[PDB]
RNA sequence: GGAGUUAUCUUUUCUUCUUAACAGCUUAUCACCCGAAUUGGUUUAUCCGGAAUGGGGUCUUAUGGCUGGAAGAGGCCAGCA
């Protein structure tokens, strides 16, 4: 499974949140278990979500496509840089590594 | 405030007067509102704002207007020696 297939399942039973400030919260306190980082996410602010994730030792999914492919997988128009997955729910993203 | 026209006739008809550096007061655009849940802006709007979120949160520039200088000075037009 690719994570964009499983993102539609996070919407229902699980919880996600989008944003730089939203992911900054979630890596510092550690409410996110798995973040997603896209391709064309801005210069400084992308690197910090890699940093804080390695620091707290929260997991990072490095994405295949760009911000448009990531944004359509959740559901807004804008160039979604990150998706912070708090709870999985219906998503089979846990049992990818078994 | 001043004058009803040489010719029939005219006092709410025409004309003249009707003003003033600076400092203080304090507005459109931009960006840590990047970020972005939401949606003010004819609107296509990812955008940015009423409204809501962080970390602990807010800000610059600036047509005009308001206020001070001006206790004082000019000026339609007249009164005396």
PDB file of C-alpha atoms (C1' of nucleotides) in Angstrom:
ATOM      1  CA  UNK A   1       0.000   0.000   0.000  1.00  0.00           C
ATOM      2  CA  UNK A   2       0.973   3.583  -0.771  1.00  0.00           C
ATOM      3  CA  UNK A   3       0.052   6.145   1.874  1.00  0.00           C
ATOM      4  CA  UNK A   4      -2.198   8.259  -0.414  1.00  0.00           C
ATOM      5  CA  UNK A   5      -4.568   5.264  -0.719  1.00  0.00           C
ATOM      6  CA  UNK A   6      -4.671   4.972   3.070  1.00  0.00           C
ATOM      7  CA  UNK A   7      -5.134   8.730   3.726  1.00  0.00           C
ATOM      8  CA  UNK A   8      -8.803   8.557   2.676  1.00  0.00           C
ATOM      9  CA  UNK A   9      -9.306   6.019   5.501  1.00  0.00           C
ATOM     10  CA  UNK A  10      -7.658   8.314   8.121  1.00  0.00           C
ATOM     11  CA  UNK A  11     -10.440  10.905   7.531  1.00  0.00           C
ATOM     12  CA  UNK A  12     -13.176   8.641   8.952  1.00  0.00           C
ATOM     13  CA  UNK A  13     -12.254   6.641  12.082  1.00  0.00           C
ATOM     14  CA  UNK A  14      -8.781   8.172  12.593  1.00  0.00           C
ATOM     15  CA  UNK A  15      -7.667  11.792  12.770  1.00  0.00           C
ATOM     16  CA  UNK A  16      -5.260  13.857  10.703  1.00  0.00           C
ATOM     17  CA  UNK A  17      -4.378  17.545  10.688  1.00  0.00           C
ATOM     18  CA  UNK A  18      -2.641  19.636   8.019  1.00  0.00           C
ATOM     19  CA  UNK A  19      -0.126  22.411   8.491  1.00  0.00           C
ATOM     20  CA  UNK A  20       3.359  23.518   9.499  1.00  0.00           C
ATOM     21  CA  UNK A  21       2.204  24.870  12.910  1.00  0.00           C
ATOM     22  CA  UNK A  22      -0.105  21.845  13.238  1.00  0.00           C
ATOM     23  CA  UNK A  23       2.787  19.405  12.666  1.00  0.00           C
ATOM     24  CA  UNK A  24       5.190  21.481  14.873  1.00  0.00           C
ATOM     25  CA  UNK A  25       2.743  20.908  17.794  1.00  0.00           C
ATOM     26  CA  UNK A  26       2.444  17.222  16.969  1.00  0.00           C
ATOM     27  CA  UNK A  27       6.180  16.457  16.804  1.00  0.00           C
ATOM     28  CA  UNK A  28       7.131  18.501  19.907  1.00  0.00           C
ATOM     29  CA  UNK A  29       4.490  16.949  22.206  1.00  0.00           C
ATOM     30  CA  UNK A  30       4.426  13.717  20.158  1.00  0.00           C
ATOM     31  CA  UNK A  31       0.725  13.276  19.314  1.00  0.00           C
ATOM     32  CA  UNK A  32       1.640  12.320  15.715  1.00  0.00           C
ATOM     33  CA  UNK A  33       2.826   8.757  15.164  1.00  0.00           C
ATOM     34  CA  UNK A  34       3.541   9.075  11.436  1.00  0.00           C
ATOM     35  CA  UNK A  35       3.906  12.278   9.402  1.00  0.00           C
ATOM     36  CA  UNK A  36       4.065  12.555   5.609  1.00  0.00           C
ATOM     37  CA  UNK A  37       6.382  15.046   3.895  1.00  0.00           C
ATOM     38  CA  UNK A  38       5.876  15.870   0.203  1.00  0.00           C
ATOM     39  CA  UNK A  39       8.253  17.084  -2.522  1.00  0.00           C
ATOM     40  CA  UNK A  40       7.753  20.824  -3.082  1.00  0.00           C
ATOM     41  CA  UNK A  41       7.232  21.824   0.575  1.00  0.00           C
ATOM     42  CA  UNK A  42       9.000  25.204   1.345  1.00  0.00           C
ATOM     43  CA  UNK A  43      12.740  25.533   1.983  1.00  0.00           C
ATOM     44  CA  UNK A  44      13.291  26.095   5.729  1.00  0.00           C
ATOM     45  CA  UNK A  45       9.947  24.908   7.048  1.00  0.00           C
ATOM     46  CA  UNK A  46      10.114  21.438   5.407  1.00  0.00           C
ATOM     47  CA  UNK A  47      13.513  20.702   6.984  1.00  0.00           C
ATOM     48  CA  UNK A  48      12.228  21.523  10.480  1.00  0.00           C
ATOM     49  CA  UNK A  49       9.490  18.879  10.237  1.00  0.00           C
ATOM     50  CA  UNK A  50      12.215  16.357   9.338  1.00  0.00           C
ATOM     51  CA  UNK A  51      14.340  17.646  12.275  1.00  0.00           C
ATOM     52  CA  UNK A  52      11.634  17.548  14.995  1.00  0.00           C
ATOM     53  CA  UNK A  53      10.483  14.116  13.774  1.00  0.00           C
ATOM     54  CA  UNK A  54      13.994  12.629  14.097  1.00  0.00           C
ATOM     55  CA  UNK A  55      14.409  14.431  17.457  1.00  0.00           C
ATOM     56  CA  UNK A  56      11.254  13.057  19.149  1.00  0.00           C
ATOM     57  CA  UNK A  57      11.757   9.839  17.124  1.00  0.00           C
ATOM     58  CA  UNK A  58       8.335  10.039  15.443  1.00  0.00           C
ATOM     59  CA  UNK A  59       8.251   8.311  12.052  1.00  0.00           C
ATOM     60  CA  UNK A  60       8.388  10.008   8.650  1.00  0.00           C
ATOM     61  CA  UNK A  61       6.857   8.740   5.419  1.00  0.00           C
ATOM     62  CA  UNK A  62       8.775  10.277   2.521  1.00  0.00           C
ATOM     63  CA  UNK A  63       6.225  10.720  -0.230  1.00  0.00           C
ATOM     64  CA  UNK A  64       6.378   9.799  -3.922  1.00  0.00           C
ATOM     65  CA  UNK A  65       4.565  12.686  -5.614  1.00  0.00           C
ATOM     66  CA  UNK A  66       4.275  16.391  -4.910  1.00  0.00           C
ATOM     67  CA  UNK A  67       2.100  18.635  -2.779  1.00  0.00           C
ATOM     68  CA  UNK A  68      -0.846  18.423  -5.211  1.00  0.00           C
ATOM     69  CA  UNK A  69      -0.871  14.582  -5.038  1.00  0.00           C
ATOM     70  CA  UNK A  70      -0.718  14.759  -1.221  1.00  0.00           C
ATOM     71  CA  UNK A  71      -3.480  17.416  -1.005  1.00  0.00           C
ATOM     72  CA  UNK A  72      -5.964  15.493  -3.175  1.00  0.00           C
ATOM     73  CA  UNK A  73      -5.353  12.454  -0.932  1.00  0.00           C
ATOM     74  CA  UNK A  74      -6.699  14.407   2.079  1.00  0.00           C
ATOM     75  CA  UNK A  75      -9.052  17.052   0.648  1.00  0.00           C
ATOM     76  CA  UNK A  76      -8.175  20.686   0.024  1.00  0.00           C
ATOM     77  CA  UNK A  77      -7.112  22.653  -3.065  1.00  0.00           C
ATOM     78  CA  UNK A  78      -3.840  24.115  -1.756  1.00  0.00           C
ATOM     79  CA  UNK A  79      -0.296  22.807  -1.915  1.00  0.00           C
ATOM     80  CA  UNK A  80      -0.400  20.516   1.131  1.00  0.00           C
ATOM     81  CA  UNK A  81       3.172  20.091   2.324  1.00  0.00           C
ATOM     82  CA  UNK A  82       2.544  17.716   5.209  1.00  0.00           C
ATOM     83  CA  UNK A  83      -0.160  15.462   6.609  1.00  0.00           C
ATOM     84  CA  UNK A  84       0.199  14.750  10.326  1.00  0.00           C
ATOM     85  CA  UNK A  85      -1.516  11.425  11.098  1.00  0.00           C
ATOM     86  CA  UNK A  86      -2.440  11.311  14.786  1.00  0.00           C
ATOM     87  CA  UNK A  87      -4.662   8.222  14.808  1.00  0.00           C
ATOM     88  CA  UNK A  88      -4.847   5.553  12.094  1.00  0.00           C
ATOM     89  CA  UNK A  89      -8.409   4.249  12.472  1.00  0.00           C
ATOM     90  CA  UNK A  90      -9.511   2.358   9.367  1.00  0.00           C
ATOM     91  CA  UNK A  91      -6.141   2.848   7.646  1.00  0.00           C
ATOM     92  CA  UNK A  92      -3.957  -0.176   6.866  1.00  0.00           C
ATOM     93  CA  UNK A  93      -0.822   2.009   7.134  1.00  0.00           C
ATOM     94  CA  UNK A  94       0.144   0.241  10.377  1.00  0.00           C
ATOM     95  CA  UNK A  95       0.208  -3.240   8.805  1.00  0.00           C
ATOM     96  CA  UNK A  96       2.447  -2.220   5.862  1.00  0.00           C
ATOM     97  CA  UNK A  97       5.486  -3.311   7.899  1.00  0.00           C
ATOM     98  CA  UNK A  98       3.278  -5.914   9.654  1.00  0.00           C
TER      99      UNK A  98
ATOM    100  C1'   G B   1     -21.666  95.447   2.744  1.00  0.00           C
ATOM    101  C1'   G B   2     -23.104  98.817  -1.473  1.00  0.00           C
ATOM    102  C1'   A B   3     -25.993 100.668  -5.948  1.00  0.00           C
ATOM    103  C1'   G B   4     -31.375 100.324  -9.016  1.00  0.00           C
ATOM    104  C1'   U B   5     -28.712 102.904 -14.536  1.00  0.00           C
ATOM    105  C1'   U B   6     -28.970 108.950 -18.860  1.00  0.00           C
ATOM    106  C1'   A B   7     -34.511 105.245 -21.551  1.00  0.00           C
ATOM    107  C1'   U B   8     -40.004 102.547 -20.349  1.00  0.00           C
ATOM    108  C1'   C B   9     -38.669 100.148 -15.601  1.00  0.00           C
ATOM    109  C1'   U B  10     -36.457  97.355 -11.459  1.00  0.00           C
ATOM    110  C1'   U B  11     -33.826  96.843  -3.685  1.00  0.00           C
ATOM    111  C1'   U B  12     -34.337  87.964  -2.517  1.00  0.00           C
ATOM    112  C1'   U B  13     -30.931  91.795  -9.614  1.00  0.00           C
ATOM    113  C1'   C B  14     -25.823  92.072 -10.381  1.00  0.00           C
ATOM    114  C1'   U B  15     -21.030  92.660  -8.484  1.00  0.00           C
ATOM    115  C1'   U B  16     -17.216  92.780  -4.788  1.00  0.00           C
ATOM    116  C1'   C B  17     -16.009  90.260  -0.241  1.00  0.00           C
ATOM    117  C1'   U B  18     -15.787  85.012   1.504  1.00  0.00           C
ATOM    118  C1'   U B  19      -7.598  83.877   3.763  1.00  0.00           C
ATOM    119  C1'   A B  20      -2.854  81.902   5.757  1.00  0.00           C
ATOM    120  C1'   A B  21       4.522  77.991   6.152  1.00  0.00           C
ATOM    121  C1'   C B  22       5.023  73.879  10.900  1.00  0.00           C
ATOM    122  C1'   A B  23       4.484  70.216  14.515  1.00  0.00           C
ATOM    123  C1'   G B  24       1.478  67.039  16.680  1.00  0.00           C
ATOM    124  C1'   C B  25      -2.633  63.954  15.381  1.00  0.00           C
ATOM    125  C1'   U B  26      -2.533  59.200  12.630  1.00  0.00           C
ATOM    126  C1'   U B  27      -4.768  56.081   6.867  1.00  0.00           C
ATOM    127  C1'   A B  28      -3.749  52.338   1.687  1.00  0.00           C
ATOM    128  C1'   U B  29       0.014  48.724   0.525  1.00  0.00           C
ATOM    129  C1'   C B  30       3.634  44.623   2.914  1.00  0.00           C
ATOM    130  C1'   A B  31       4.991  40.483   6.215  1.00  0.00           C
ATOM    131  C1'   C B  32       5.980  35.225  11.355  1.00  0.00           C
ATOM    132  C1'   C B  33      -0.615  35.453   9.386  1.00  0.00           C
ATOM    133  C1'   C B  34       5.203  32.501   6.358  1.00  0.00           C
ATOM    134  C1'   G B  35       1.648  29.005   8.548  1.00  0.00           C
ATOM    135  C1'   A B  36      -3.406  27.957   7.352  1.00  0.00           C
ATOM    136  C1'   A B  37      -9.058  25.611   9.911  1.00  0.00           C
ATOM    137  C1'   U B  38     -12.334  29.103   7.776  1.00  0.00           C
ATOM    138  C1'   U B  39     -14.225  32.642   3.892  1.00  0.00           C
ATOM    139  C1'   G B  40     -14.391  39.543   3.820  1.00  0.00           C
ATOM    140  C1'   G B  41     -12.912  40.971  -1.490  1.00  0.00           C
ATOM    141  C1'   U B  42     -18.246  41.899  -8.842  1.00  0.00           C
ATOM    142  C1'   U B  43     -15.280  37.605  -8.471  1.00  0.00           C
ATOM    143  C1'   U B  44     -12.736  32.190 -11.500  1.00  0.00           C
ATOM    144  C1'   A B  45      -9.166  32.396  -5.829  1.00  0.00           C
ATOM    145  C1'   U B  46      -5.030  27.360  -3.406  1.00  0.00           C
ATOM    146  C1'   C B  47      -5.094  33.431  -2.105  1.00  0.00           C
ATOM    147  C1'   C B  48      -5.540  37.060   1.775  1.00  0.00           C
ATOM    148  C1'   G B  49      -9.596  39.356   5.953  1.00  0.00           C
ATOM    149  C1'   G B  50     -14.211  39.684   9.476  1.00  0.00           C
ATOM    150  C1'   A B  51     -13.454  35.103  12.618  1.00  0.00           C
ATOM    151  C1'   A B  52     -10.186  31.204  14.480  1.00  0.00           C
ATOM    152  C1'   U B  53      -5.521  28.906  15.574  1.00  0.00           C
ATOM    153  C1'   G B  54      -0.009  28.450  17.374  1.00  0.00           C
ATOM    154  C1'   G B  55       5.070  29.868  20.392  1.00  0.00           C
ATOM    155  C1'   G B  56       4.376  34.077  24.003  1.00  0.00           C
ATOM    156  C1'   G B  57       2.365  36.897  20.116  1.00  0.00           C
ATOM    157  C1'   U B  58       1.246  41.135  16.208  1.00  0.00           C
ATOM    158  C1'   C B  59       4.190  45.382  13.475  1.00  0.00           C
ATOM    159  C1'   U B  60       6.193  48.907   9.801  1.00  0.00           C
ATOM    160  C1'   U B  61       5.148  52.631   5.595  1.00  0.00           C
ATOM    161  C1'   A B  62       1.146  56.385   4.561  1.00  0.00           C
ATOM    162  C1'   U B  63      -3.240  60.575  -0.169  1.00  0.00           C
ATOM    163  C1'   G B  64      -6.677  62.897   3.479  1.00  0.00           C
ATOM    164  C1'   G B  65      -8.579  64.511   8.290  1.00  0.00           C
ATOM    165  C1'   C B  66      -8.085  66.295  13.177  1.00  0.00           C
ATOM    166  C1'   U B  67      -4.960  69.829  16.219  1.00  0.00           C
ATOM    167  C1'   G B  68      -1.373  73.618  17.267  1.00  0.00           C
ATOM    168  C1'   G B  69       1.050  78.288  15.646  1.00  0.00           C
ATOM    169  C1'   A B  70      -2.193  83.171  15.276  1.00  0.00           C
ATOM    170  C1'   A B  71      -2.715  86.602  22.564  1.00  0.00           C
ATOM    171  C1'   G B  72      -2.337  88.223  16.688  1.00  0.00           C
ATOM    172  C1'   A B  73      -2.545  89.972  11.100  1.00  0.00           C
ATOM    173  C1'   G B  74      -5.202  91.276   6.173  1.00  0.00           C
ATOM    174  C1'   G B  75      -9.598  92.748   3.586  1.00  0.00           C
ATOM    175  C1'   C B  76     -15.449  94.617   0.555  1.00  0.00           C
ATOM    176  C1'   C B  77     -16.278  99.553   2.820  1.00  0.00           C
ATOM    177  C1'   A B  78     -16.008 104.274   5.795  1.00  0.00           C
ATOM    178  C1'   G B  79     -14.760 108.201   9.738  1.00  0.00           C
ATOM    179  C1'   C B  80     -11.672 112.642  10.891  1.00  0.00           C
ATOM    180  C1'   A B  81      -7.516 116.161  11.194  1.00  0.00           C
TER     181        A B  81
END
